[PDB]
């Protein structure tokens, strides 16, 4: 009856055990929202998209700062400020990436709403397993848990890197030391 994460709180009604990373940590009861097209399905899809985006962004920042930029690309070690140097010399790359992300996000929203309507697609599912790393069950649950935990950690990390780069105008590991 009590949430596993917060023993002083009752179990959130909509979070039983199903989703990976579920420990009952919903103090504000946001999982019970059923308005403005927002429900547990939409919240989970948003959480998974945030997890994946944060993982990609943190990996990119760390890669560029440690191993350096790719040939022909600007340096500076400040990832929040090197973006304007890339846009100053290769605006077409940024524009094409933005257009591609826009199209993919329109497709993602359509897929989310459709899967919410005629329930056949789990939240965050895009059938993207080209290498077959999660075919069999009893490993899919473990992979989902790993992805969720890594994505939450990378969300926090990427938000921290964004704020550090905006404020200190220095590199992430530069702030570290």
């Amino acid at each position: 009856e009590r949430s596993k994460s917060l023993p002083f709180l009752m179990k959130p009604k909509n979070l039983d055990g199903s989703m990976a990373g579920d420990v009952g940590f919903d103090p504000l009861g946001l999982s019970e929202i059923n308005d403005v097209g927002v429900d547990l399905y939409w919240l989970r899809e948003a959480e998974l998209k945030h997890c994946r985006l944060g993982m990609m962004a943190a990996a990119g920042i760390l890669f560029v700062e440690i191993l350096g930029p790719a040939p022909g690309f600007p340096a500076g070690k400040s990832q929040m400020d090197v973006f304007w140097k890339v846009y100053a010399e290769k605006p077409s790359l940024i524009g094409a990436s933005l257009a591609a992300i826009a199209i993919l996000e329109v497709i993602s929203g359509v897929a989310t709403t459709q899967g919410r309507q005629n329930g056949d697609r789990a939240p965050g599912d895009y059938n993207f397993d080209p290498l077959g790393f999660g075919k069999d069950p009893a490993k899919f649950k473990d992979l989902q848990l790993k992805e969720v935990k890594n994505g939450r950690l990378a969300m926090i990390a990427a938000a921290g890197m964004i704020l550090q780069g905006v404020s200190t105008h220095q590199g992430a590991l530069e702030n570290l030391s």
């Binding site: 497709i107 359509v110 897929a111 005629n118 697609r121 599912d125 059938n127």
Partner: protein, 168 residues
């Protein structure tokens, strides 16, 4: 359910299997409120127009017709051809063809039996049975889509950088 192209999206519910080049790609559901034959005709018309346009752009940046008016790049050829009246002739004959097309598409939508884009233009055969016709329709659709995207890229790159045939 679970359209072939986008495996996580539902089938567009208007494209089951009985159209050439039908991989179930309609995420925004254009076929849900527009006739399928109308959209097919529009797509095939775009394919043919853009194939001709890509070939003409690339060729005219290499070979020029005799005369001083034809000595401009394809990027600047529009303002020269419109002034000389060269594009007026193309406009006149294209308008005639498109009025006949108005009649044809109206008849196709109101029964008839004319397949979308089927003008029966076939001096040579190149398509003897149903299988050959289907294969060549798929080839035409794929080549037309590729040429539409290719002309888009060619024009955008040439406008961005006023370069010759290599528009990099």
């Amino acid at each position: 359910e679970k359209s072939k192209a986008v495996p996580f999206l539902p089938r567009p519910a208007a494209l089951d299997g009985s159209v050439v080049g039908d991989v179930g790609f309609d995420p925004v559901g254009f076929t849900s409120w527009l006739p399928l034959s109308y959209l097919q005709e529009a797509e095939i018309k775009h394919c043919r127009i853009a194939m001709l346009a890509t070939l003409g752009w690339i060729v005219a940046d290499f070979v020029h017709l005799p005369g001083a008016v034809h000595e401009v790049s394809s990027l600047a050829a529009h303002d020269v051809a419109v002034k000389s009246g060269a594009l007026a002739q193309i406009l006149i004959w294209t308008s005639i063809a498109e009025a006949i097309s108005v009649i044809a598409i109206s008849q196709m939508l109101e029964g008839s039996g004319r397949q979308p884009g089927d003008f029966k233009f076939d001096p040579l055969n190149f398509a003897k049975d149903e299988k050959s016709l289907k294969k060549m329709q798929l080839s035409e659709l794929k080549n037309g889509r590729l040429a539409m995207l290719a002309f888009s890229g060619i024009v955008t790159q040439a406008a961005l950088t006023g370069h010759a045939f290599p528009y990099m």
